[PDB]
Design a protein around this ligand. Structure first.
Ligand SMILES: [Cl-]
Ligand SMILES: [Cl-]
Lengths: 133, 135, 133, 132
């Protein structure tokens, strides 16, 4: 119990393939309402370019996302400031803001975020940390 | 959640409405947005700031208040939306709106012509304003 | 003209892994100027997401793009008309207009563009055709 | 000759200040990309209700045609500029050409103004032409 990591869309995407390795740790994981849509839009672009099992895959992504705790939305107010100050998009900035102000570890697969978010790690790093418990 | 909601407002509409507070404020219980709406409105203001909007900060505070006035619905099932996306040739983001409006029997208010076309019962901000003026 | 096919970003991106299969038919393969940027952006997103071999891969992509002939830019007002009438992005509409306008076969991996561009085909269909020659 | 490389956000604003720069056109160039980005912005406005999109598309055609068009950069290079300076491949494309070509990047994008040596905005470009 008690959230420790905030997972963004590219991290969630990577994680969907290691279900077993982390579900037992699902209590330490969270996302934003935003992630659901971003994961969806990414699955959508794949179906647009030919992914055949998009439907089945769509069900599995749904199951993966259901495993996570969902945090409250950050104030648009603050996020914009962080986006303007760090050269991030409003989307990425939302994760950086919530992670730092909430004292959480931001798991992302983006190189820009890892570098502009204090304490940010990648999916792999998250895995070693979880396996060590 | 609530139930006095008749309209689902999207980012493009919300943005237009932001400059017509008075005409709809007293009807607020009738309008709703999705969580996604918060980020989309933000991303739009963000782009203006990136392009040199002087008052982005002040404007962000205003946009914030405007958003606080709306009821926020629950997130839709991912798979359903993806299907609507694929079927009507919409982005997953825009399909989230079409699905929720039609699934809940709500009127989608959008400024996007494509959405108006593929979402049954959808109206634009102007149409929304007239309907409110008469009630 | 000897050119028969207009290849877009999604087509071009896949084609890059079947170099030998089309390189001999190259003089029948063309792209738009936009194609360069779109392809570079796709690789960029991959690097932003942790693609280690992005330095070397960008070189392979350059070579790939160099094998294609580059068509002249379409009229903005025409491309917009198509984008608005068929519900396509301006970028996508470009390919639709040029291909149909020039009597070429649009090769796209985008279901949306296939369904909306008269004669459009996918990469697989392109290969089988070149195979018959 | 060419002195300034104008991107999409800049090209778009300048389209309202035609008389202020035509006579200076030969000093103005874009990328092939600039055509697609401009058209995509008008498309968004048309999608969002703009009524005079057809007419507006013609004026944009004329404006865009008044600019020389540089050769496409080595996808090779550009990518590097973008990874290092945290830009997108599109923006980086402009930072590369202007620099590697000793041109002054003209952009309405704060992020680019700051990551491209000697880059200036629309207003800045307009005061200069006023002088010359
Ligand atoms: Cl960025
Ligand atoms: Cl679309």
């Amino acid at each position: 119990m008690a959230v420790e990591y905030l997972v963004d869309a590219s991290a969630l995407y990577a994680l969907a393939a290691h279900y077993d390795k982390w579900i037992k740790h699902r209590e330490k994981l969270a996302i934003l309402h935003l992630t659901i849509y971003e994961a969806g839009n990414a699955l959508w672009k794949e179906a647009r370019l030919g992914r055949v099992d998009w439907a089945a895959a769509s069900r599995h992504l749904k199951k993966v996302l259901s495993s996570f705790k969902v945090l409250e939305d950050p104030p648009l107010d603050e996020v914009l400031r962080v986006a303007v100050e760090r050269g991030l998009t409003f989307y990425d900035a939302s994760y950086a803001y919530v992670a730092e102000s909430s004292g959480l570890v931001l798991v992302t697969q983006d190189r820009e975020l890892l570098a502009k978010t204090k304490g940010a790690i990648d999916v792999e790093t998250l895995l070693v940390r979880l396996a060590a418990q």
